[PDB]
Amino acid sequence: ADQLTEEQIAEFKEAFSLFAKDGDGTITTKELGTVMRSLGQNPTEAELQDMINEVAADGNGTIDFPEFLTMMARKMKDTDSEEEIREAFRVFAKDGNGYISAAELRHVMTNLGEKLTDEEVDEMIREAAIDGDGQVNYEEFVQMMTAK
Template structure:
């Protein structure tokens, strides 16, 4: 998942970072981090903002330098993209829209689409995913399987 931001995304990030760099010293206060990432299209909770601040403020100064911000922001953007892809994939296979896919459907998908897996790997994934053992896999179970892949 170690994707990089595109040139246009990097320009947008640099521009937004500069707007929040109040004294022009190449640093943004951690207290402004929530507003900064929201200005770039993410919508983190306050808990997530605090986690991002701890992650980006590697030296504990209460200030975030541009390179630290870009590294942290890239990880979070990639994570959001992955979650959106999983939600989209789940919706494709949840034909009835009831919030579940059958273990048989998951088996078919994993054996035949995309990166083909061995029968034993698929059996292990289904055993892990079908936590309740009812033959149905809900969104959380599905996401866990795909993220572990």
């Protein structure tokens, strides 16, 4: 699981609360993304009804603030390529000795990321050294995906 800042939430209440209700302190869907569009993100048109249905469901007719943000990261987990790498390397980074070969990563990071290129690899390679064995590991390389 990835950690998040508590001050961005101060950004999360800036919007939700602008639409804040008198009851449990909830809001609707059309204007909730205005909470999602504020941090530098944006939600889908059909998901506001379903994922919000996971937190705005209980029989109120709207969305509350507490769990609406907890699910917010699941949405950034919907467009997160870094959450997929940990998953892929189990297919390419275990061909023997346990350290993935320098030639697989470019096929791995590229396998998860559509925008992410080989230059992403060659950029992290310089730090990996690669020379001597010609290959690299998972804890040293992909770990640079979590750091960079």
